[PDB]
Amino acid sequence: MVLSEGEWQLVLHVWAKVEADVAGHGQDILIRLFKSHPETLEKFDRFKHLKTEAEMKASEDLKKHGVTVLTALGAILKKKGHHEAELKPLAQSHATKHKIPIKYLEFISEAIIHVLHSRHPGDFGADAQGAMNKALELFRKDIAAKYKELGYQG
Numbered sequence: 001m002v003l004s005e006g007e008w009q010l011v012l013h014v015w016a017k018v019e020a021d022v023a024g025h026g027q028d029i030l031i032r033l034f035k036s037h038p039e040t041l042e043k044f045d046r047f048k049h050l051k052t053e054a055e056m057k058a059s060e061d062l063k064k065h066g067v068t069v070l071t072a073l074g075a076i077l078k079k080k081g082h083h084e085a086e087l088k089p090l091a092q093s094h095a096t097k098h099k100i101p102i103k104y105l106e107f108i109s110e111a112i113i114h115v116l117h118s119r120h121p122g123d124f125g126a127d128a129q130g131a132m133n134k135a136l137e138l139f140r141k142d143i144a145a146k147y148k149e150l151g152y153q154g
């Protein structure tokens with residue numbers, strides 16, 4: 001489903017606030033993912049030793065990864081749907097090396113929404129959350145199509 005410019009602007013105006021401190025947002029989002037759906041942590045050989053939220057919060061390398069994740073996602077969002085070039089390497093690594101099912105991409109989308117909702121009520125009212133959800137649905141739909149092309153049933 002194609003987003004309107006108005007919807008993209010709601011997405012980008014909350015992303016602008018994420019970008020005040022991407023590192024802290026990335027910690028919150030990865031931690032929320034791992035707490036809400038612990039099976040997702042097991043996909044990270046790099047991080048699955050972390051036992052508690054405290055350990056997660058103290059991990060500089062998890063923080064680093066959260067910045068990488070959110071910056072990659074931000075670049076995708078800023079393309080406003082024209083994200084074919086960005087999705088290719090992402091889909092290929094996530095299909096073939098990391099083996100991340102679409103269901104787990106749903107889980108991180110949920111975590112993103114939850115953190116934005118908590119942190120940014122001024123820029124994440126119902127319409128803005130709907131726009132973000134549409135953007136993440138488009139991301140997951142297009143990633144799923146690439147997964148199929150790449151041979152992964154996701």
Ligand code: HEM
Pocket residue numbers: 040041043044045046068069070072073089090093094098100104105108
């Ligand atoms: C918004 C969705 C996501 C984005 C934008 C994202 C982005 C990235 C980026 C940019 C990398 C580093 C380059 C690469 O290997 O592609 C990465 C690595 C990785 N991703 Fe994701 N990712 C997302 C969701 C997920 C989810 C939900 C999982 C697991 C449940 C996952 C598992 C991994 C793993 C295991 C790595 C390798 C980490 C390491 O050992 O360095 N990703 N991701």
